Amino acid sequence: DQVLKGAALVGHNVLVPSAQVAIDATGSAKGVVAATSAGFVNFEITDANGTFVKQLSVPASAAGEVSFAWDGTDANGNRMAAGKYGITATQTDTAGAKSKLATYVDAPVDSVTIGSDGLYLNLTGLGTSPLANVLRVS
Amino acid sequence: DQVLKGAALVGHNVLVPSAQVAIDATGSAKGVVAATSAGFVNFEITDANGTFVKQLSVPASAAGEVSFAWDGTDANGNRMAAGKYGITATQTDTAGAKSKLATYVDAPVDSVTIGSDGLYLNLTGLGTSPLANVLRVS
Numbered sequence: 001d002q003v004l005k006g007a008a009l010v011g012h013n014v015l016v017p018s019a020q021v022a023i024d025a026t027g028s029a030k031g032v033v034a035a036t037s038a039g040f041v042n043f044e045i046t047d048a049n050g051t052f053v054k055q056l057s058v059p060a061s062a063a064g065e066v067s068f069a070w071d072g073t074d075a076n077g078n079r080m081a082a083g084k085y086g087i088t089a090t091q092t093d094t095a096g097a098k099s100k101l102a103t104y105v106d107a108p109v110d111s112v113t114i115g116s117d118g119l120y121l122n123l124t125g126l127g128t129s130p131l132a133n134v135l136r137v138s
Numbered sequence: 139d140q141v142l143k144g145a146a147l148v149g150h151n152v153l154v155p156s157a158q159v160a161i162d163a164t165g166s167a168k169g170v171v172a173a174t175s176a177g178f179v180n181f182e183i184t185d186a187n188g189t190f191v192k193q194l195s196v197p198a199s200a201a202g203e204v205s206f207a208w209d210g211t212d213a214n215g216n217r218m219a220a221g222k223y224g225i226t227a228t229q230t231d232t233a234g235a236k237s238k239l240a241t242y243v244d245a246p247v248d249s250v251t252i253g254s255d256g257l258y259l260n261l262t263g264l265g266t267s268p269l270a271n272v273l274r275v276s
Binding site: 017018019020036046048049050084086087088089090097098099100101102103104127132133135136 | 155156157158174184186187188222224225226227228235236237238239240241242265270271273274
């Protein structure tokens with residue numbers, strides 16, 4: 001099946017549901033979230049223990065997709081260590097109503113592996129992901 | 139395309155990436171998370187403002203899927219109001235290393251709608267979801 005030819009993903013970038021994002025030493029982690037109303041969404045980055053790292057805010061013209069991007073630095077301008085960081089997204093509509101939105105992280109498909117348990121994508125920085133958890137190639 | 143016959147989803151349950159879960163007045167919200175190591179995972183339920191509601195903990199024989207279930211009550215045994223609640227999952231492996239895991243919520247596909255923007259699933263309690271964000275029918 002092309003459930004095999006999904007090897008064409010190798011070399012490209014994908015969007016997968018992830019509660020965390022990753023950065024190397026050069027920096028930058030991007031992704032998107034689906035806003036259900038107009039307003040703004042605040043993306044909070046925490047560390048291993050759960051310590052505050054940085055916070056981003058993005059306006060939302062109206063319901064729809066909304067992108068985010070972390071430069072890999074803390075609120076104090078400091079470049080954080082390469083590794084995986086937790087990310088939480090909270091929406092606030094025009095009215096003040098709050099809600100948690102699912103985060104989708106963008107990552108490069110370094111390679112694909114086909115083992116006994118099906119086909120898996122080896123996402124750079126993030127790790128492993130079953131071909132299926134993919135939201136789309138963007 | 140059967141990208142249309144995915145109307146067979148109506149009446150069944152699906153697993154979709156969600157940062158929140160929902161409960162009616164009778165109760166119960168379930169879902170799953172993919173543990174990357176053996177240990178335990180703690181699911182924390184928060185409210186609209188972000189107030190603590192309840193916390194669940196589940197052991198993990200080893201890397202793999204792990205299910206969760208909230209009875210709709212707070213840590214103090216109180217039945218919370220019907221509605222949407224935020225859920226966060228944190229893994230702790232045998233060693234004490236912590237990590238945030240992506241949450242997938244199980245919800246009944248009340249119906250399917252096909253509009254100008256493609257086909258959408260009307261998930262009971264959660265709301266809307268584009269056919270694609272679905273992880274699988276379970």
